[PDB]
Amino acid sequence: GCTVGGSQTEGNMNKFGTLNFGKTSGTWNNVLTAEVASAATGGNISVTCDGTDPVDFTVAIDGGERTDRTLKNTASADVVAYNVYRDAARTNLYVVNQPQQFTTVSGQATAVPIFGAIAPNTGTPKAQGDYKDTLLVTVNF
Amino acid sequence: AVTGQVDVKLNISTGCTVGGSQTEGNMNKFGTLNFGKTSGTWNNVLTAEVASAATGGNISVTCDGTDPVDFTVAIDGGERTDRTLKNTASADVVAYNVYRDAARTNLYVVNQPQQFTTVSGQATAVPIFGAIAPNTGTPKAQGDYKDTLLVTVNF
Amino acid sequence: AVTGQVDVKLNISTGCTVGGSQTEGNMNKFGTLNFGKTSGTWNNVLTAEVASAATGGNISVTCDGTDPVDFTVAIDGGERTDRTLKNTASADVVAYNVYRDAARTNLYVVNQPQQFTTVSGQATAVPIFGAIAPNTGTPKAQGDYKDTLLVTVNF
Amino acid sequence: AVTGQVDVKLNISTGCTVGGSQTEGNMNKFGTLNFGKTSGTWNNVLTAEVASAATGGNISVTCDGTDPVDFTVAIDGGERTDRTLKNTASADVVAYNVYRDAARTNLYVVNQPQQFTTVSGQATAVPIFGAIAPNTGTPKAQGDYKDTLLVTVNF
Amino acid sequence: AVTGQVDVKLNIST
Amino acid sequence: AVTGQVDVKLNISTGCTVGGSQTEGNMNKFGTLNFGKTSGTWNNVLTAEVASAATGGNISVTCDGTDPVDFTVAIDGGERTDRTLKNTASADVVAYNVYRDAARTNLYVVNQPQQFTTVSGQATAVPIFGAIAPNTGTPKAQGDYKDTLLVTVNF
């Protein structure tokens, strides 16, 4: 089989990382954008396979806690819509419950870029506080 | 089947915003580092400044607050991670670098938060000064050389 | 975390080069505008020409090609953006200006492309004529006054 | 002529708000402490709870934030500063007191910040429990007795 | 600082 | 050259003095009108009392003599003359007003001598009750809003 590096075992569930957009004001005009930071090292999730022939493994991310990729305020019911892309230019979207293909060769670790992106909110100012979500990334074969 | 969790976070409270950018699809287009036209072998250091895509001048970062805020600026190594422009057709490369000060001394080191200050009711400019070494050895092939540096304004 | 893109470009095909410069580290040292020595209050307009750092004469821009290319020359406003030389120790300032013609008439307006012509097999000189107004009011403090004008040969 | 300065301040950032009040002109009407009707000499402790002017129930203070906020509540001594209701026509007085807990034990001491907690997405109630001592001595004159306690929700 | 009023009342009659 | 005269006068005989102030340089610092912290949009009327800079309580004006003197109190319109607090960095304004009585009714009209009484061997307090209208329209920018009302105790 193939194994995923960069994760830490949170109890009995693999903690892959954090998508930290940082701090922001009620109404942001710029697209807020941050990359996943692996919980084990701090860098990108490094998936390596165990073998000699290049294995083709897939990566699938789900829709978050509420299934529509929205971060929720810890106290109030305000939501913040977001999305995770695979490429650096926010074009190749990790479609909900879809196996975005990936390659991996022997004696090498391939990185899984989970690039976050949030649309410019120039309408209503969301309430103050911390917004969260827990995307379940599914490395499957 | 290795299923794992990715905690997503955002602290909506009091943040800083970057002006001079245009939203290219879902990615902020900050600007262009246009060195201009050049011959195969140039003896003078080719040098140009970033031109914001929104206004044409320098990127103007302003912070949405009253008290001074210390924000950082980090630029990455380009498409290939070694600050080289690549010819659109051939595989020729053109090494370059981005500096912060007008005298090409304070280099924006790869993946490093070059510090910055921002004050009450003001927009601070982010000088991204480009610079290319004098190539007096081999003439690079004709055509257009490009690169996409990702500038990372982070707090 | 506001991450953005900066497109870098360079068109290697057929360009123009500036002679008379020396590479100071990674910044082209074009020359010096040396007005010379002076007293606290001078009645005569102090006037000197740029001396290229490489040869000592005028900056000689030559283009690389066969058809006469039309290149432009732009000079900025100096370190403080208002063409003032500053004393190395004190805060005294000395206002000046750079003109293009020998009679101090055609001023190199701040951030403006003063046009220029250049033919094949020839080097055209870039006259940067300095000029300082007669100070017959207050005697500026003793010492050395400096400024670093950035000359921008662009196409 | 003694002219002096009074600095006015307001920190607009992330505050707490009090619900259950109605704006009486330019002063927040929080509620009513209605003991009801009574005879000249009452043997039982007359006791009633505050009724918010907006809803009729208890004052509901909610904080506009996510993390828990510790806000304080202070009540003053009434119109005459000794918690006495005064007859509208005559000069008779009726001493009373406001407590915080249901058993009339935790007294809202005059000009004191009785602490309070408020949590995520919730409105905390401010129990202002009134209590009057048994008057078995002199019968106070007939009519209506009133007082206006100023409740001070401060941070 | 949200200062507010609480009208206190008592009808001594019967 | 328009030279003119300004007669200066002072009647040292039997005057009245204002307590609770601290001499800020050569200007009497009377106190602070601290509304406290607040969110962008507040529904409750924000309300706070002046706190003397010397003691922390109310300004205590006492007169020097044996017969009860009638002194007046006048407050001006603030820095911009329309009783608006201004954000230290941005240009946002917060309209407010100062009243004399506890129920926000008797307004200290701009540049008006609100009358006051004072007896011998006693200090009378000057209640400067602040009040801000409920802003339920636009959320003012984050930061600190300030104003300096000049209180004018005159005879």
Tab-separated table of N, CA, C and O in Angstrom, chain F residues 16-121:
chain	number	residue	atom	x	y	z
F	16	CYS	N	-15.106	82.842	42.914
F	16	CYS	CA	-15.539	81.457	43.009
F	16	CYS	C	-14.524	80.535	42.321
F	16	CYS	O	-13.968	80.895	41.280
F	17	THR	N	-14.271	79.354	42.889
F	17	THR	CA	-13.278	78.419	42.333
F	17	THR	C	-13.854	77.042	41.965
F	17	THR	O	-14.774	76.560	42.602
F	18	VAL	N	-13.280	76.393	40.953
F	18	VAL	CA	-13.769	75.085	40.530
F	18	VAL	C	-12.834	73.955	40.993
F	18	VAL	O	-11.656	73.952	40.636
F	19	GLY	N	-13.341	73.004	41.780
F	19	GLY	CA	-12.526	71.897	42.248
F	19	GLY	C	-12.740	70.681	41.367
F	19	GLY	O	-13.702	70.635	40.602
F	20	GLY	N	-11.848	69.699	41.470
F	20	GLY	CA	-11.928	68.488	40.664
F	20	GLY	C	-11.110	68.554	39.378
F	20	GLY	O	-11.077	67.593	38.590
F	21	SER	N	-10.431	69.674	39.162
F	21	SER	CA	-9.632	69.839	37.964
F	21	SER	C	-8.143	69.690	38.264
F	21	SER	O	-7.702	69.867	39.397
F	22	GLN	N	-7.386	69.363	37.226
F	22	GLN	CA	-5.949	69.196	37.307
F	22	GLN	C	-5.398	70.132	36.246
F	22	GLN	O	-5.974	70.249	35.168
F	23	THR	N	-4.302	70.816	36.539
F	23	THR	CA	-3.748	71.739	35.563
F	23	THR	C	-2.932	70.991	34.504
F	23	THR	O	-1.796	70.597	34.768
F	24	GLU	N	-3.489	70.793	33.310
F	24	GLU	CA	-2.748	70.151	32.238
F	24	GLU	C	-1.924	71.265	31.597
F	24	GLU	O	-2.440	72.011	30.763
F	25	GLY	N	-0.656	71.390	31.974
F	25	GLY	CA	0.155	72.460	31.428
F	25	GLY	C	-0.488	73.768	31.870
F	25	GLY	O	-0.582	74.013	33.068
F	26	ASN	N	-0.956	74.596	30.932
F	26	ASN	CA	-1.580	75.869	31.297
F	26	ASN	C	-3.083	75.869	31.002
F	26	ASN	O	-3.688	76.929	30.842
F	27	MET	N	-3.685	74.682	30.936
F	27	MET	CA	-5.117	74.562	30.669
F	27	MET	C	-5.764	73.615	31.692
F	27	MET	O	-5.326	72.478	31.831
F	28	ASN	N	-6.806	74.063	32.386
F	28	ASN	CA	-7.457	73.239	33.404
F	28	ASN	C	-8.118	71.961	32.859
F	28	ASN	O	-9.096	72.048	32.114
F	29	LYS	N	-7.603	70.784	33.221
F	29	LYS	CA	-8.201	69.525	32.789
F	29	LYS	C	-9.346	69.221	33.752
F	29	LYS	O	-9.105	68.826	34.893
F	30	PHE	N	-10.588	69.407	33.313
F	30	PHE	CA	-11.735	69.190	34.180
F	30	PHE	C	-12.108	67.728	34.360
F	30	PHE	O	-12.403	67.306	35.479
F	31	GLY	N	-12.098	66.938	33.288
F	31	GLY	CA	-12.465	65.543	33.464
F	31	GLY	C	-12.561	64.737	32.190
F	31	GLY	O	-12.015	65.122	31.137
F	32	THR	N	-13.248	63.597	32.275
F	32	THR	CA	-13.403	62.719	31.132
F	32	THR	C	-14.845	62.207	31.017
F	32	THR	O	-15.506	61.934	32.030
F	33	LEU	N	-15.357	62.149	29.798
F	33	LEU	CA	-16.706	61.653	29.543
F	33	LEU	C	-16.448	60.337	28.828
F	33	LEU	O	-16.366	60.294	27.599
F	34	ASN	N	-16.318	59.261	29.597
F	34	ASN	CA	-15.962	57.968	29.044
F	34	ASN	C	-17.180	57.086	28.786
F	34	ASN	O	-17.714	56.481	29.713
F	35	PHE	N	-17.599	56.974	27.523
F	35	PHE	CA	-18.757	56.142	27.196
F	35	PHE	C	-18.434	54.650	27.262
F	35	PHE	O	-19.336	53.818	27.369
F	36	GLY	N	-17.151	54.318	27.198
F	36	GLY	CA	-16.706	52.945	27.282
F	36	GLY	C	-16.539	52.334	25.917
F	36	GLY	O	-16.435	53.031	24.909
F	37	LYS	N	-16.522	51.003	25.877
F	37	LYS	CA	-16.378	50.256	24.628
F	37	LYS	C	-17.746	50.032	23.989
F	37	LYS	O	-18.767	50.019	24.680
F	38	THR	N	-17.767	49.854	22.672
F	38	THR	CA	-19.018	49.628	21.950
F	38	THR	C	-18.772	48.992	20.586
F	38	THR	O	-17.668	49.059	20.047
F	39	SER	N	-19.813	48.378	20.030
F	39	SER	CA	-19.726	47.734	18.727
F	39	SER	C	-20.084	48.710	17.658
F	39	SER	O	-20.441	49.873	17.908
F	40	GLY	N	-19.905	48.323	16.372
F	40	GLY	CA	-20.186	49.190	15.243
F	40	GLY	C	-21.578	49.794	15.286
F	40	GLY	O	-21.750	50.993	15.069
F	41	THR	N	-22.577	48.961	15.566
F	41	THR	CA	-23.961	49.414	15.628
F	41	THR	C	-24.575	49.123	17.005
F	41	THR	O	-24.831	47.966	17.331
F	42	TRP	N	-24.809	50.159	17.815
F	42	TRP	CA	-25.391	49.972	19.137
F	42	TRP	C	-26.875	50.374	19.138
F	42	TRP	O	-27.227	51.425	18.608
F	43	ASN	N	-27.742	49.552	19.733
F	43	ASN	CA	-29.170	49.858	19.776
F	43	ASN	C	-29.565	50.649	21.020
F	43	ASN	O	-30.593	51.321	21.034
F	44	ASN	N	-28.784	50.500	22.083
F	44	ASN	CA	-29.040	51.225	23.318
F	44	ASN	C	-28.300	52.567	23.313
F	44	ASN	O	-27.186	52.666	22.801
F	45	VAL	N	-28.924	53.593	23.887
F	45	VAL	CA	-28.338	54.926	23.981
F	45	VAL	C	-27.079	54.815	24.848
F	45	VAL	O	-27.186	54.451	26.017
F	46	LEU	N	-25.889	55.113	24.310
F	46	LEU	CA	-24.687	54.950	25.154
F	46	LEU	C	-24.637	56.137	26.097
F	46	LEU	O	-24.777	57.277	25.656
F	47	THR	N	-24.444	55.893	27.394
F	47	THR	CA	-24.554	56.958	28.374
F	47	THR	C	-23.531	56.880	29.507
F	47	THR	O	-23.479	55.860	30.183
F	48	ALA	N	-22.747	57.941	29.739
F	48	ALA	CA	-21.769	57.955	30.822
F	48	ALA	C	-21.675	59.358	31.407
F	48	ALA	O	-22.044	60.335	30.757
F	49	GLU	N	-21.182	59.449	32.638
F	49	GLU	CA	-21.061	60.710	33.352
F	49	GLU	C	-19.615	61.179	33.357
F	49	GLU	O	-18.703	60.371	33.215
F	50	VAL	N	-19.419	62.487	33.490
F	50	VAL	CA	-18.084	63.039	33.550
F	50	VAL	C	-17.364	62.557	34.811
F	50	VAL	O	-17.976	62.459	35.865
F	51	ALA	N	-16.077	62.235	34.697
F	51	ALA	CA	-15.287	61.804	35.835
F	51	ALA	C	-14.171	62.836	35.998
F	51	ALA	O	-13.287	62.917	35.145
F	52	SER	N	-14.201	63.631	37.071
F	52	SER	CA	-13.183	64.659	37.293
F	52	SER	C	-11.766	64.079	37.239
F	52	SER	O	-11.506	63.003	37.785
F	53	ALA	N	-10.829	64.801	36.621
F	53	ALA	CA	-9.458	64.296	36.506
F	53	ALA	C	-8.690	64.275	37.833
F	53	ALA	O	-7.741	63.510	37.986
F	54	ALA	N	-9.103	65.106	38.785
F	54	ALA	CA	-8.434	65.186	40.079
F	54	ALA	C	-8.864	64.107	41.076
F	54	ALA	O	-8.032	63.504	41.747
F	55	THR	N	-10.168	63.910	41.230
F	55	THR	CA	-10.658	62.923	42.187
F	55	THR	C	-11.245	61.647	41.577
F	55	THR	O	-11.075	60.561	42.135
F	56	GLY	N	-11.924	61.770	40.445
F	56	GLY	CA	-12.552	60.625	39.818
F	56	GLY	C	-14.066	60.753	39.871
F	56	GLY	O	-14.774	60.121	39.086
F	57	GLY	N	-14.566	61.573	40.799
F	57	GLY	CA	-15.990	61.800	40.945
F	57	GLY	C	-16.454	62.986	40.114
F	57	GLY	O	-15.856	63.307	39.093
F	58	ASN	N	-17.520	63.649	40.549
F	58	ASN	CA	-18.048	64.789	39.802
F	58	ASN	C	-17.300	66.089	40.112
F	58	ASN	O	-16.782	66.261	41.214
F	59	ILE	N	-17.247	66.997	39.142
F	59	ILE	CA	-16.575	68.274	39.339
F	59	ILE	C	-17.261	68.974	40.517
F	59	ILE	O	-18.478	69.130	40.514
F	60	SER	N	-16.494	69.395	41.523
F	60	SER	CA	-17.100	70.034	42.688
F	60	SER	C	-16.751	71.516	42.734
F	60	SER	O	-15.651	71.877	43.150
F	61	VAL	N	-17.676	72.381	42.317
F	61	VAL	CA	-17.386	73.801	42.332
F	61	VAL	C	-17.768	74.392	43.688
F	61	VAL	O	-18.890	74.183	44.158
F	62	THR	N	-16.863	75.131	44.322
F	62	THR	CA	-17.163	75.757	45.598
F	62	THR	C	-16.891	77.257	45.429
F	62	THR	O	-16.051	77.655	44.612
F	63	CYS	N	-17.633	78.098	46.134
F	63	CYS	CA	-17.362	79.524	46.036
F	63	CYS	C	-16.664	79.970	47.308
F	63	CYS	O	-16.772	79.324	48.348
F	64	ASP	N	-15.940	81.080	47.218
F	64	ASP	CA	-15.212	81.604	48.369
F	64	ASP	C	-15.907	82.825	48.972
F	64	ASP	O	-15.661	83.951	48.541
F	65	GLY	N	-16.767	82.605	49.965
F	65	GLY	CA	-17.474	83.698	50.611
F	65	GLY	C	-18.544	83.207	51.570
F	65	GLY	O	-18.613	82.011	51.871
F	66	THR	N	-19.372	84.141	52.048
F	66	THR	CA	-20.457	83.827	52.968
F	66	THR	C	-21.858	83.901	52.361
F	66	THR	O	-22.751	83.223	52.829
F	67	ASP	N	-22.095	84.715	51.343
F	67	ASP	CA	-23.448	84.738	50.782
F	67	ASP	C	-23.549	83.758	49.616
F	67	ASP	O	-22.584	83.571	48.877
F	68	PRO	N	-24.723	83.122	49.443
F	68	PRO	CA	-24.832	82.154	48.345
F	68	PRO	C	-24.643	82.821	46.978
F	68	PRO	O	-25.471	83.651	46.607
F	69	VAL	N	-23.589	82.471	46.242
F	69	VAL	CA	-23.356	83.079	44.936
F	69	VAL	C	-24.022	82.281	43.808
F	69	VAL	O	-24.089	81.052	43.873
F	70	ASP	N	-24.512	82.976	42.781
F	70	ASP	CA	-25.152	82.318	41.651
F	70	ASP	C	-24.145	82.299	40.507
F	70	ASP	O	-23.907	83.332	39.877
F	71	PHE	N	-23.542	81.144	40.230
F	71	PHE	CA	-22.554	81.048	39.161
F	71	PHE	C	-23.129	80.273	38.001
F	71	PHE	O	-24.047	79.470	38.173
F	72	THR	N	-22.594	80.515	36.814
F	72	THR	CA	-23.109	79.833	35.641
F	72	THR	C	-22.126	78.817	35.056
F	72	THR	O	-20.905	78.873	35.313
F	73	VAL	N	-22.674	77.880	34.281
F	73	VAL	CA	-21.871	76.852	33.637
F	73	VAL	C	-22.184	76.811	32.142
F	73	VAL	O	-23.352	76.705	31.765
F	74	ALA	N	-21.165	76.896	31.286
F	74	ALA	CA	-21.388	76.856	29.848
F	74	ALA	C	-20.412	75.873	29.217
F	74	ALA	O	-19.226	75.873	29.542
F	75	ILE	N	-20.908	75.012	28.324
F	75	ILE	CA	-20.071	74.047	27.652
F	75	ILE	C	-20.145	74.419	26.177
F	75	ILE	O	-21.197	74.838	25.693
F	76	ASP	N	-19.036	74.273	25.462
F	76	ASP	CA	-18.991	74.620	24.046
F	76	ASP	C	-19.343	73.389	23.179
F	76	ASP	O	-19.813	72.374	23.717
F	77	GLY	N	-19.245	73.511	21.847
F	77	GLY	CA	-19.558	72.440	20.916
F	77	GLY	C	-18.486	71.425	20.555
F	77	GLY	O	-18.634	70.720	19.560
F	78	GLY	N	-17.372	71.390	21.281
F	78	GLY	CA	-16.306	70.448	20.978
F	78	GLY	C	-15.334	70.973	19.939
F	78	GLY	O	-15.461	72.106	19.472
F	79	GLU	N	-14.352	70.152	19.573
F	79	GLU	CA	-13.344	70.521	18.597
F	79	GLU	C	-13.913	71.016	17.291
F	79	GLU	O	-13.411	71.976	16.717
F	80	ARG	N	-14.923	70.343	16.751
F	80	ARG	CA	-15.469	70.759	15.455
F	80	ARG	C	-16.708	71.653	15.523
F	80	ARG	O	-17.307	71.943	14.484
F	81	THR	N	-17.112	72.015	16.749
F	81	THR	CA	-18.283	72.859	17.079
F	81	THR	C	-19.681	72.242	16.837
F	81	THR	O	-20.679	72.964	16.870
F	82	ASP	N	-19.766	70.931	16.605
F	82	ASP	CA	-21.063	70.268	16.420
F	82	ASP	C	-21.205	68.994	17.274
F	82	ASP	O	-21.975	68.092	16.940
F	83	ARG	N	-20.454	68.936	18.370
F	83	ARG	CA	-20.471	67.824	19.325
F	83	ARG	C	-20.356	66.448	18.672
F	83	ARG	O	-21.208	65.584	18.867
F	84	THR	N	-19.287	66.250	17.905
F	84	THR	CA	-19.032	64.974	17.247
F	84	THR	C	-17.675	64.427	17.677
F	84	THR	O	-16.678	65.158	17.662
F	85	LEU	N	-17.603	63.155	18.047
F	85	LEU	CA	-16.316	62.607	18.385
F	85	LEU	C	-15.689	62.156	17.076
F	85	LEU	O	-16.395	61.669	16.204
F	86	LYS	N	-14.386	62.324	16.914
F	86	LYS	CA	-13.752	61.951	15.663
F	86	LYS	C	-12.815	60.764	15.850
F	86	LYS	O	-12.144	60.668	16.879
F	87	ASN	N	-12.751	59.866	14.873
F	87	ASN	CA	-11.869	58.755	15.010
F	87	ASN	C	-10.454	59.288	14.910
F	87	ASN	O	-10.185	60.135	14.079
F	88	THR	N	-9.543	58.806	15.743
F	88	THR	CA	-8.155	59.236	15.685
F	88	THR	C	-7.514	59.079	14.297
F	88	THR	O	-6.738	59.940	13.886
F	89	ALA	N	-7.826	58.003	13.570
F	89	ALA	CA	-7.207	57.801	12.247
F	89	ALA	C	-8.072	58.164	11.027
F	89	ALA	O	-7.633	58.899	10.149
F	90	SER	N	-9.271	57.597	10.967
F	90	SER	CA	-10.221	57.841	9.878
F	90	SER	C	-11.029	59.121	10.119
F	90	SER	O	-10.847	59.786	11.134
F	91	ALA	N	-11.916	59.473	9.189
F	91	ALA	CA	-12.722	60.686	9.335
F	91	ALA	C	-14.153	60.440	9.831
F	91	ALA	O	-15.001	61.326	9.730
F	92	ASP	N	-14.422	59.252	10.366
F	92	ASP	CA	-15.753	58.935	10.868
F	92	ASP	C	-16.083	59.811	12.079
F	92	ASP	O	-15.196	60.151	12.860
F	93	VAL	N	-17.356	60.173	12.245
F	93	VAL	CA	-17.755	61.017	13.370
F	93	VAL	C	-18.864	60.361	14.184
F	93	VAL	O	-19.651	59.577	13.650
F	94	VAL	N	-18.939	60.672	15.474
F	94	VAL	CA	-19.975	60.112	16.338
F	94	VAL	C	-20.675	61.248	17.084
F	94	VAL	O	-20.131	61.783	18.052
F	95	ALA	N	-21.876	61.630	16.649
F	95	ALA	CA	-22.607	62.716	17.280
F	95	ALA	C	-23.023	62.384	18.729
F	95	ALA	O	-23.487	61.277	19.002
F	96	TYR	N	-22.861	63.344	19.648
F	96	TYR	CA	-23.245	63.160	21.041
F	96	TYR	C	-23.777	64.474	21.602
F	96	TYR	O	-24.016	65.386	20.851
F	97	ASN	N	-24.120	64.503	22.899
F	97	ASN	CA	-24.616	65.700	23.559
F	97	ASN	C	-24.404	65.555	25.060
F	97	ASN	O	-24.327	64.438	25.575
F	98	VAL	N	-24.309	66.677	25.758
F	98	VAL	CA	-24.124	66.649	27.202
F	98	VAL	C	-25.362	67.256	27.862
F	98	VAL	O	-25.792	68.344	27.474
F	99	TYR	N	-25.963	66.558	28.824
F	99	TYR	CA	-27.137	67.085	29.507
F	99	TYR	C	-26.762	67.382	30.952
F	99	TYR	O	-25.725	66.934	31.438
F	100	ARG	N	-27.616	68.137	31.636
F	100	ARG	CA	-27.360	68.523	33.019
F	100	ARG	C	-28.069	67.649	34.049
F	100	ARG	O	-27.535	67.419	35.134
F	101	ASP	N	-29.272	67.188	33.727
F	101	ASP	CA	-30.028	66.360	34.654
F	101	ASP	C	-29.880	64.880	34.327
F	101	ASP	O	-29.629	64.503	33.178
F	102	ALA	N	-30.138	64.036	35.332
F	102	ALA	CA	-30.024	62.574	35.222
F	102	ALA	C	-30.916	61.889	34.168
F	102	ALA	O	-30.598	60.789	33.721
F	103	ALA	N	-32.017	62.528	33.774
F	103	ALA	CA	-32.911	61.980	32.765
F	103	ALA	C	-32.642	62.463	31.324
F	103	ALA	O	-33.531	62.338	30.482
F	104	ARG	N	-31.446	62.999	31.026
F	104	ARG	CA	-31.093	63.440	29.674
F	104	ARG	C	-32.082	64.432	29.045
F	104	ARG	O	-32.238	64.452	27.829
F	105	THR	N	-32.704	65.279	29.869
F	105	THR	CA	-33.678	66.265	29.383
F	105	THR	C	-33.160	67.705	29.274
F	105	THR	O	-33.336	68.337	28.242
F	106	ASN	N	-32.556	68.224	30.342
F	106	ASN	CA	-32.047	69.582	30.379
F	106	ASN	C	-30.692	69.607	29.704
F	106	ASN	O	-29.667	69.335	30.330
F	107	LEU	N	-30.687	69.941	28.423
F	107	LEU	CA	-29.474	69.959	27.616
F	107	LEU	C	-28.564	71.167	27.870
F	107	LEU	O	-29.040	72.289	28.038
F	108	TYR	N	-27.249	70.940	27.893
F	108	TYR	CA	-26.330	72.050	28.045
F	108	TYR	C	-26.218	72.608	26.657
F	108	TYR	O	-25.356	72.186	25.886
F	109	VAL	N	-27.084	73.561	26.314
F	109	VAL	CA	-27.077	74.157	24.979
F	109	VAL	C	-25.714	74.793	24.659
F	109	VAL	O	-25.091	75.400	25.534
F	110	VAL	N	-25.263	74.663	23.409
F	110	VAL	CA	-23.974	75.196	22.973
F	110	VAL	C	-23.785	76.672	23.366
F	110	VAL	O	-24.669	77.491	23.116
F	111	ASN	N	-22.644	77.001	23.979
F	111	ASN	CA	-22.343	78.368	24.399
F	111	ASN	C	-23.479	79.039	25.175
F	111	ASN	O	-23.842	80.178	24.885
F	112	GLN	N	-24.034	78.334	26.157
F	112	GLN	CA	-25.104	78.906	26.971
F	112	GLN	C	-24.811	78.745	28.461
F	112	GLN	O	-24.336	77.697	28.901
F	113	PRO	N	-25.078	79.808	29.250
F	113	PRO	CA	-24.802	79.752	30.687
F	113	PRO	C	-25.857	79.023	31.513
F	113	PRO	O	-26.711	79.699	32.092
F	114	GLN	N	-25.819	77.705	31.587
F	114	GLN	CA	-26.806	77.020	32.396
F	114	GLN	C	-26.565	77.454	33.862
F	114	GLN	O	-25.516	77.124	34.432
F	115	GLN	N	-27.530	78.168	34.474
F	115	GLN	CA	-27.439	78.679	35.867
F	115	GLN	C	-27.158	77.588	36.937
F	115	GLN	O	-27.471	76.393	36.733
F	116	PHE	N	-26.559	78.036	38.054
F	116	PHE	CA	-26.241	77.160	39.187
F	116	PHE	C	-26.160	77.939	40.508
F	116	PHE	O	-25.800	79.117	40.521
F	117	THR	N	-26.461	77.278	41.623
F	117	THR	CA	-26.402	77.923	42.933
F	117	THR	C	-25.274	77.320	43.767
F	117	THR	O	-24.852	76.189	43.527
F	118	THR	N	-24.794	78.075	44.750
F	118	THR	CA	-23.717	77.601	45.609
F	118	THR	C	-23.760	78.327	46.961
F	118	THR	O	-23.815	79.553	46.991
F	119	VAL	N	-23.746	77.595	48.075
F	119	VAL	CA	-23.784	78.229	49.389
F	119	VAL	C	-22.415	78.141	50.060
F	119	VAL	O	-21.552	77.379	49.632
F	120	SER	N	-22.230	78.935	51.113
F	120	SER	CA	-20.973	78.968	51.854
F	120	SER	C	-20.709	77.644	52.572
F	120	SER	O	-21.645	76.965	52.992
F	121	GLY	N	-19.434	77.279	52.710
F	121	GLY	CA	-19.051	76.044	53.380
F	121	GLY	C	-19.644	74.798	52.754
F	121	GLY	O	-20.029	73.865	53.456
